[PDB]
Amino acid sequence: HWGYGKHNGPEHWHKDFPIAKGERQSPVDIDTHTAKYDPSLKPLSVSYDQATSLRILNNGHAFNVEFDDSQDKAVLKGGPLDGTYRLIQFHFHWGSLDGQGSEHTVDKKKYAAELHLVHWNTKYGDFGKAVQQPDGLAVLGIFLKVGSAKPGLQKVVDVLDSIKTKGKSADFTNFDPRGLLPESLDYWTYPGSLTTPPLLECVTWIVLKEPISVSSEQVLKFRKLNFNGEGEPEELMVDNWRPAQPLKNRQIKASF
Ligand SMILES: Cc1cc(C)[n+](CCc2c[nH]cn2)c(C)c1
Ligand SMILES: [Hg+2]
Ligand SMILES: [Zn+2]
Incomplete structure (x- = not known):
């Protein structure tokens, strides 16, 4: 099945998943000089105070921190969005080296990692019905660079020993995603896709x-994760990113 290696990687995905070559695929390069400030974007609203994390899963391509999405507790609205989108999970993409790892690029610049906080449009009832809809999901993408440690990431870094291999999961209640945001909520927006x-x-x-x-020693521990399942040849979890895809007519809007 699909992966990130020479034989199952992003360039083989189209065979099984033809939308790989579609009209609104992600990620893309964010050309800062082509992006246009959009006056009609309302302010962004990130409400993560009542957030109920439940568990962390190594799913063999990344790790997911999952949330209880049965109620409006952690939500995105405002900005380009109409109505309410609930947080279901978050996860990252990263590299073997600091000079690569992000999925989106800013002026062809690759950051060391990329955080995806995945949300679904409540008017669709569940996650499964929202993924059948053009306005079904809203993903908040956040770039990671190596520098000083990110305090709000450390509880995640500490649990990764317990989820080394594909299929393993640990209990991860009372995690606050607010600790993963940057200071500013400035943003580019565009219509796109799941990147896996x-x-x-x-x-x-x-x-x-x-x-x-994030610290060098925070990303190092990301890089110790396995793609494989327990008792298999060790395959390190690195370079789990899709490269930038063609923009194709689409327009990237800036909030600032
Ligand atoms: C990065 C990513 C995040 C999520 C929630 N998903 C799940 C989407 C899905 C498709 N069919 C059922 N769920 C995928 C495939 C990739
Ligand atoms: Hg869709
Ligand atoms: Zn992702």
């Missing part, structure tokens, strides 16, 4: 301009 198979073009992408910085 099945690559559904159901996403409103909100990519923040200001990266968070």
Whole structure:
């Protein structure tokens, strides 16, 4: 099945998932000089105070921190969005080296990692129905650079020993995603897709301009994760990113 290697990687995905070559695929390069400030974007609203994390899963391509989305507790609204989108999970993409890892690029610049906070449009009832809709998902993308440690990331870094291999999961209640945001909520927005198979073009992408910085020793522990399952040849979890895809007519809007 699909992966990130020479034989199952992003350039093989189209065979099984033809939308790989579609009209609104992600990620893309954010040309800062082509992006246009949009006066009609309302302010962004990130309400993560009542957030109920539940568990962390190594799913063999990344790790997911999952939230109880049965109520409006952690939500995105405002900005390019109409109505309410609930937080279901977050996860990251990162590299083997600091000079690569992000999925979106800013003027062809690759950051060391990329955080995705995934939300679904409540008027669709569940996550599964929202992924069948062009306005179904809203993803908040946040870049990571290496520098000083990110305090709000450390509880995640500490649990990764317990989820080394594909299929393992640990209990991860009372985690606050507020600790993963940068200071500023400036953002580029565009219409797009899931960046992993099945690559559904159901996403409103909100990519923040200001990266968070993380320690070298925080990313190092990300890099110790395995793609494989327990008792298999060790395959390190690195370079789990899709490269930038063609923009194709689409327009990236700036909030600032
Ligand atoms: C990065 C990413 C995040 C999520 C929630 N998903 C799940 C989407 C999905 C498709 N069919 C059922 N769920 C995928 C495939 C990728
Ligand atoms: Hg869709
Ligand atoms: Zn992602």
